[PDB]
Amino acid sequence: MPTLLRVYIDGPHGMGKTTTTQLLDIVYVPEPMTYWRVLGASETIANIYTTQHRLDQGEISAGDAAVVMTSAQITMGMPYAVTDAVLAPHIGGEAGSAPPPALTLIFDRHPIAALLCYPAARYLMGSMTPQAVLAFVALIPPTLPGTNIVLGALPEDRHIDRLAKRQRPGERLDLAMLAAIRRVYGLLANTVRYLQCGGSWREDWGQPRPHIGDTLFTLFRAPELLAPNGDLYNVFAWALDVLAKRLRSMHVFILDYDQSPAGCRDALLQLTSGMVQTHVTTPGSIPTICDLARTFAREMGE
Amino acid sequence: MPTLLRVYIDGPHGMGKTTTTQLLVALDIVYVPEPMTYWRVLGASETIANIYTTQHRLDQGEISAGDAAVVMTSAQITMGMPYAVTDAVLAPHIGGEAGSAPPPALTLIFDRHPIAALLCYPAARYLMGSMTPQAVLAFVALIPPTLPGTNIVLGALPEDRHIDRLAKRQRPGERLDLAMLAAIRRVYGLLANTVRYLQCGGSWREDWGQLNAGPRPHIGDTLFTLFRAPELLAPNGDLYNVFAWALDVLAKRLRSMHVFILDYDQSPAGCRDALLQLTSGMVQTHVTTPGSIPTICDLARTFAREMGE
Ligand SMILES: O=c1[nH]c(=O)n([C@H]2C[C@H](O)[C@@H](CO)O2)cc1I
């Protein structure tokens, strides 16, 4: 059966991901901007940044910001969620990780962006409950074989300069969200290594590979998740087992962004060499995926 | 290898599902209750009270539509988490179908399936104007893959009788909304139809233009009929592909479910035995490890101990 290579370009916003991956047998599943702005709701991006502003300015409550914020995170990852679901059937097993794949699918972000990272970063900003965050983790789709996630690398001061340009419609420069999101993505990369090096959160919770204190597990030592004796409630501990399961099988690659669009584009091409591809499940899988990838781009990509 | 029998008793509230599920277990078998404690303390505060009050404010014209959807969506997310984590934690243990075939080593009886929190209630609330169709479709797209041996028992009770029942059985925060009762009832009716329409070979894409245990129902008698919303329609007249792809997920999730109907218009003991009768002809599954049994047993017993009642 033909082989496919899936590549999910992810990381904090304002790094140059999209603006260097478009540059990059090869299909590009762009950002669902039309779905965020119109199809699922109107100006979701604007709504997100405005609520954090009213929150920050004391015009609304933590609880107000939280319901508005949770609701919107559902809108943000909808296209990512259906795409996975419709795609999942065609993904076969690892391809003796071989000749060039029949198709390379470049995604502008992975389902965990809206299901884990942004929700985690907003909890870190005081606008989302760790319980809501864990609800989204619990809803992360199973990790199919060949899930290659490229995360971005760029110094802060430089990310601020880019961010100053990658201003989405409705977006407001919030260096705190920029720091909350950078940290979240940082912990994300540490979590994968932790899990892949054989770390057990249950065994390390009472506080070579990263320290549990440097993985995403640190965020869930939140007072809301703990019983009167400091015990993590089981529902939550089960949501953490699922986070461990989902993340350990992912393949993570770092693309340094502190270089030229060419260089970034050039680097992404090199990383390609160690990504895990897979076989499709049917003869028509490739053609169907392509049309899927083109139909998504036309409709929701702006 | 040891087999397992999972049964989710679902359907509208105010019918007697929880009582009979209990009874059934009072006759091994383990009970996975409604995460009441999660809905009112662990996940958030008084979520059921929050749900019924928001619709109310909506109805009173005190809150706008958008205000309510924002609250409903969030509330519905809290309502389903225990169901969703339990399902994701169970999954690695579920093996292939066995059948019924002799008695199972373990029988799990669930109070509602994940699709209640991720589909039925949201669809009923959309229908009540308290949530958006895109949001419902967003939940649908997130319904977990249907494990084999998914036996769903949906309840039936005459409308008048259901109404009088509701007029008693007090849930904290729940305020008697009969419009919501009918909505939830119709949603569950469409659900049953949908599973079947799907099993009789129905194709929503082939039948879109038209908008066993019985003949194939009409697409307009299935859940697909709710998604004929102008919000989800492209200027050309058809659904945008995002929503169309979500409906493909719905058909895929409900196609492998084994739905059964239980009559609630009888005594609690009757419902128990009527249910204990449906059970026999229900699909079983092996577990993936022998120790899946003890594992599964404790998860259920732990869930109940921490979230039930
Ligand atoms: O789940 C998400 N939540 C969120 O708030 N965003 C913001 C980041 C950026 O400003 C713009 C483009 O990424 O959208 C993105 C995602 I995916």
Ligand SMILES: O=c1[nH]c(=O)n([C@H]2C[C@H](O)[C@@H](CO)O2)cc1I
């Ligand atoms: O997703 C859900 N949404 C909802 O509104 N409910 C209501 C029904 C009943 O009032 C009470 C107990 O079931 O909670 C239940 C679920 I599961």
